[PDB]
Amino acid sequence: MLDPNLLRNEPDAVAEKLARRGFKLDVDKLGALEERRKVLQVKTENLQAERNSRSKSIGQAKARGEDIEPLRLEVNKLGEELDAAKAELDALQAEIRDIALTIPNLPADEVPVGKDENDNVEVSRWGTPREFDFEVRDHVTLGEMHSGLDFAAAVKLTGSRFVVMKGQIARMHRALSQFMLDLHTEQHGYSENYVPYLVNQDTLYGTGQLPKFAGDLFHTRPLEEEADTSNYALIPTAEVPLTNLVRGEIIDEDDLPIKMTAHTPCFRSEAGSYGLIRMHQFDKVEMVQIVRPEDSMAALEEMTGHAEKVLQLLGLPYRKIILCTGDMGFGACKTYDLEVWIPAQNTYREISSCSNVWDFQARRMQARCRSKKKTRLVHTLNGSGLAVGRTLVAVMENYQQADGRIEVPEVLRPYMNGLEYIGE
Amino acid sequence: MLDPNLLRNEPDAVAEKLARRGFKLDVDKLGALEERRKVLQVKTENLQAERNSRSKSIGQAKARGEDIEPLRLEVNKLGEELDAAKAELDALQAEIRDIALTIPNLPADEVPVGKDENDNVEVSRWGTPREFDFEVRDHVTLGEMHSGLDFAAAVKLTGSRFVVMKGQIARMHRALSQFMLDLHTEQHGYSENYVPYLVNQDTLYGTGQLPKFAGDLFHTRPLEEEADTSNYALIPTAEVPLTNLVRGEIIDEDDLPIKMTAHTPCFRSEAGSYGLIRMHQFDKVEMVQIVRPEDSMAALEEMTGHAEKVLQLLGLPYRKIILCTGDMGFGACKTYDLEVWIPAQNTYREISSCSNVWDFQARRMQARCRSKKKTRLVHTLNGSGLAVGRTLVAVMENYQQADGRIEVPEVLRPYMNGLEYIGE
Numbered sequence: 065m066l067d068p069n070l071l072r073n074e075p076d077a078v079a080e081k082l083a084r085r086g087f088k089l090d091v092d093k094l095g096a097l098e099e100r101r102k103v104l105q106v107k108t109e110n111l112q113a114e115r116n117s118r119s120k121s122i123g124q125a126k127a128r129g130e131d132i133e134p135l136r137l138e139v140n141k142l143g144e145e146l147d148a149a150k151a152e153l154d155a156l157q158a159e160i161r162d163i164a165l166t167i168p169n170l171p172a173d174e175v176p177v178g179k180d181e182n183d184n185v186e187v188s189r190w191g192t193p194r195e196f197d198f199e200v201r202d203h204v205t206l207g208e209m210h211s212g213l214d215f216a217a218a219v220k221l222t223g224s225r226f227v228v229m230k231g232q233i234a235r236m237h238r239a240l241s242q243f244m245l246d247l248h249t250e251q252h253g254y255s256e257n258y259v260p261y262l263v264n265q266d267t268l269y270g271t272g273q274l275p276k277f278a279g280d281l282f283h284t285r286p287l288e289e290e291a292d293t294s295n296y297a298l299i300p301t302a303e304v305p306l307t308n309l310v311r312g313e314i315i316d317e318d319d320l321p322i323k324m325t326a327h328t329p330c331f332r333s334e335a336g337s338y339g340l341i342r343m344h345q346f347d348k349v350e351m352v353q354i355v356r357p358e359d360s361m362a363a364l365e366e367m368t369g370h371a372e373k374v375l376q377l378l379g380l381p382y383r384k385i386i387l388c389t390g391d392m393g394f395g396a397c398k399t400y401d402l403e404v405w406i407p408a409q410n411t412y413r414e415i416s417s418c419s420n421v422w423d424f425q426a427r428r429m430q431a432r433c434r435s436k437k438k439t440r441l442v443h444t445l446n447g448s449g450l451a452v453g454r455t456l457v458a459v460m461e462n463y464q465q466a467d468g469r470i471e472v473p474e475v476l477r478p479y480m481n482g483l484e485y486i487g488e
Numbered sequence: 489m490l491d492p493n494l495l496r497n498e499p500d501a502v503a504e505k506l507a508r509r510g511f512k513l514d515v516d517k518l519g520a521l522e523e524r525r526k527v528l529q530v531k532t533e534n535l536q537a538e539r540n541s542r543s544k545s546i547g548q549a550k551a552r553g554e555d556i557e558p559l560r561l562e563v564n565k566l567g568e569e570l571d572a573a574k575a576e577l578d579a580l581q582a583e584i585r586d587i588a589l590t591i592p593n594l595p596a597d598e599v600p601v602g603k604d605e606n607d608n609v610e611v612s613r614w615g616t617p618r619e620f621d622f623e624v625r626d627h628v629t630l631g632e633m634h635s636g637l638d639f640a641a642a643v644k645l646t647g648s649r650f651v652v653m654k655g656q657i658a659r660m661h662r663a664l665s666q667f668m669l670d671l672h673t674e675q676h677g678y679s680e681n682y683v684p685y686l687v688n689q690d691t692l693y694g695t696g697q698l699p700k701f702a703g704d705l706f707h708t709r710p711l712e713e714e715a716d717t718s719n720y721a722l723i724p725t726a727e728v729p730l731t732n733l734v735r736g737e738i739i740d741e742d743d744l745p746i747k748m749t750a751h752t753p754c755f756r757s758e759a760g761s762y763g764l765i766r767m768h769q770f771d772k773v774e775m776v777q778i779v780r781p782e783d784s785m786a787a788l789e790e791m792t793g794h795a796e797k798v799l800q801l802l803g804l805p806y807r808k809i810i811l812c813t814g815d816m817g818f819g820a821c822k823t824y825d826l827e828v829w830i831p832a833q834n835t836y837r838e839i840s841s842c843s844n845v846w847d848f849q850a851r852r853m854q855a856r857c858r859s860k861k862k863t864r865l866v867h868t869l870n871g872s873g874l875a876v877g878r879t880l881v882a883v884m885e886n887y888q889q890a891d892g893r894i895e896v897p898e899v900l901r902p903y904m905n906g907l908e909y910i911g912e
């Protein structure tokens with residue numbers, strides 16, 4: 065959520081910034097509700113003043129032995145009017161909140177104005193794409209040659225946009241996630257976490273999947289024996305459980321930054337999309353940071369660096385892209401995307417997204433920090449380090465040999481019993 | 489499913505064997521439906537004989553120039569009677585099938601007759617429980633001392649029967665699953681697999697979770713853009729996707745055994761149950777075997793051995809229990825359970841279940857083998873090698889020191905950057 069004070073005091077500048085990312089802030093609707101809220105706030109106060117007075121008058125009557133019955137009808141009619149007003153006020157505060165929750169984050173000033181993917185700016189690149197001395201085979205070809213990718217088996221087991229990985233390919237996918245977690249926990253100061261893969265409605269509201277993106281998720285039907293408390297959704301990213309670990313907390317500023325990593329499957333309905341490029345299930349090693357507000361922009365650099373180190377150590381050429389206002393996620397105020405070289409596509413494909421979410425989720429979770437005094441909202445960040453299946457594609461394609469074998473990157477050989485190549 | 493021929497030809501012996509496991513086979517209901525099926529089969533044949541004859545008579549009329557209109561009414565009335573009969577027959581064949589699918593597996597003759605957990609027989613044991621020279625702390629205590637188990641964080645993120653693991657505890661849990669997969673793939677001839685965690689209705693019918701155990705599962709609501717093909721359930725065990733990989737196949741007997749392993753989260757509604765002992769989500773390294781019918785009992789020994797090797801290499805004392813007729817799972821014909829020593833409970837707790845499922849799932853999946861000649865059903869087996877959270881509990885409790893630190897078992901130190909102990 066955005067600061068309610070900016071929406072009440074500077075709506076025209078908020079709308080101006082939100083328009084840059086393609087959101088039209090309905091200033092007139094919002095202002096009408098906001099105005100009716102103040103009118104109701106006063107109406108309850110006046111009704112309470114009148115009730116207290118008539119009730120103090122009913123006291124003078126009971127003391128003077130007067131007819132204390134007409135004033136009793138007066139006080140009860142006021143008590144009803146008060147209740148109707150508090151009811152209208154609560155319903156109104158709920159409508160404003162519902163609206164507040166549909167508003168995306170305000171973008172950082174250094175974010176370039178743009179409409180879509182074509183307006184994102186390349187800020188840097190590393191490594192040089194391999195000059196192949198043969199016809200480049202794609203990851204589906206390479207997978208099937210090695211009997212390691214089986215899309216038909218997954219359709220039989222579940223349906224489309226699912227995969228079954230077998231043998232050395234499955235081992236490589238596994239090695240990649242172990243290498244990522246070990247890098248981040250042993251070298252980048254992240255603490256490892258095993259989190260639930262099903263989360264509740266409060267958690268989803270916390271990181272911003274709710275109320276607007278329910279359709280992007282897999283929802284589980286409630287359990288018979290947990291009838292009213294098991295309305296769960298499958299996690300779309302480890303950012304969701306990880307960021308919510310500080311939900312409703314007041315952290316000592318000296319205990320910040322909190323750096324968390326986790327390796328989980330990720331589940332996406334993939335609505336609106338028509339091999340291992342966009343699945344319903346995919347693994348990702350996630351990085352989450354809880355920081356002081358003064359440190360989030362530094363933390364974004366640090367975290368992107370951590371994601372970049374995975375690519376560098378695996379010898380995978382990539383480029384760093386700053387997203388434009390119109391290509392960011394709902395909760396982001398600034399995003400860097402890392403795009404890896406895919407030989408078979410003769411282009412760079414997204415492998416990570418690192419964002420500074422500002423105080424947007426902290427406001428929804430009421431995640432604050434103290435100095436050591438008064439409290440204020442922390443900032444949150446999240447980035448992939450990395451999306452494992454996309455890394456596997458990149459490794460298979462970039463390390464393929466003329467004979468169809470796949471060279472195991474040096475850093476993965478200890479995770480693969482010292483194996484030099486996939487296949488014979 | 490059981491062999492339809494045993495149910496039709498030897499029902500009294502089938503019922504006798506099923507009663508041993510507490511199932512009352514409704515021989516009289518089944519026999520009534522079976523009988524009405526044969527009557528309908530004949531009724532359709534007679535109606536077809538009559539229609540063909542009257543239709544051949546209608547031909548003699550068209551040839552002789554006779555009134556070929558009454559016979560036309562006769563042939564169409566017969567065609568209707570045929571349709572009603574084929575409709576009654578199909579509805580009946582569906583009722584019989586529905587019943588066939590509720591019947592549990594017939595138990596092996598060496599399975600002891602018993603009513604519950606108290607009638608299971610200990611067949612062997614390994615190792616001696618540690619003689620503690622201090623007050624034994626439980627895994628919740630040990631977890632919390634090391635800030636590695638957080639049950640309150642999981643309730644906030646999702647709800648009850650979920651856990652959040654952090655730091656060296658999460659690392660140890662991770663190390664355990666890596667050690668298990670590496671043991672089974674490098675030493676026990678299992679091929680590694682990355683499978684979907686959501687599966688379809690056919691898959692669930694295949695391994696036997698359906699039709700009887702829908703309530704034990706988490707079900708996902710169908711996706712808007714996959715409206716009629718996304719009625720999925722979360723996998724309760726990797727046995728489900730793994731065993732179904734051979735569904736509808738005819739395997740060359742020389743390609744058997746098929747040995748598959750996988751590390752997945754497992755999701756159970758846990759209906760009827762009132763720390764890390766019975767969660768809604770838990771990890772398990774599963775072993776699955778597809779074998780010739782002559783090899784399943786040998787394969788059960790082999791697989792239990794593979795599960796036992798995990799416990800031995802981790803220096804964890806355990807006992808091997810043969811389940812009695814009344815304590816087996818629906819699809820099992822024979823089960824060995826490995827139960828590990830839990831110091832804080834002064835008893836052995838289940839860590840693995842290894843079963844010979846016979847041709848029960850193979851019959852549902854129509855998974856057959858040829859020699860490279862004619863075909864016959866394969867046998868399937870599955871066993872935990874092992875349930876990861878239960879192994880973590882066992883390791884934390886059995887390796888705890890007087891100062892609260894946890895000694896890292898020798899085999900896990902390479903998976904934990906050479907760490908000797910958890911905590912300082």
Ligand SMILES: Nc1nc(-c2cccnc2)nc2c1ncn2[C@@H]1O[C@H](COS(=O)(=O)NC(=O)[C@@H](N)CO)[C@@H](O)[C@H]1O
Binds near residue numbers: 340343416417
């Ligand atoms: N549906 C999907 N399928 C696959 C995929 C990957 C490999 C094989 N098969 C499928 N990757 C996805 C994906 N959705 C996202 N990703 C990959 O995940 C990365 C990060 O995802 S993101 O949505 O851009 N951002 C977050 O979720 C944040 N928590 C930061 O990680 C992206 O850069 C992609 O590489």
Ligand SMILES: Nc1nc(-c2cccnc2)nc2c1ncn2[C@@H]1O[C@H](COS(=O)(=O)NC(=O)[C@@H](N)CO)[C@@H](O)[C@H]1O
Binds near residue numbers: 724727768772
């Ligand atoms: N709900 C549950 N929770 C936990 C658990 C474990 C650790 C921490 N928290 C929870 N373990 C379970 C469990 N249900 C089963 N297990 C563990 O899984 C083992 C095998 O499960 S079983 O249902 O007995 N059999 C299968 O699923 C077969 N696929 C063979 O593995 C059992 O022996 C238990 O140790």
Ligand SMILES: [Cl-]
Binds near residue numbers: 285286
């Ligand atoms: Cl429902």
Ligand SMILES: [Cl-]
Binds near residue numbers: 440441
């Ligand atoms: Cl505030």
Ligand SMILES: [Cl-]
Binds near residue numbers: 710
């Ligand atoms: Cl529905």
Ligand SMILES: [Cl-]
Binds near residue numbers: 864865
């Ligand atoms: Cl048969």
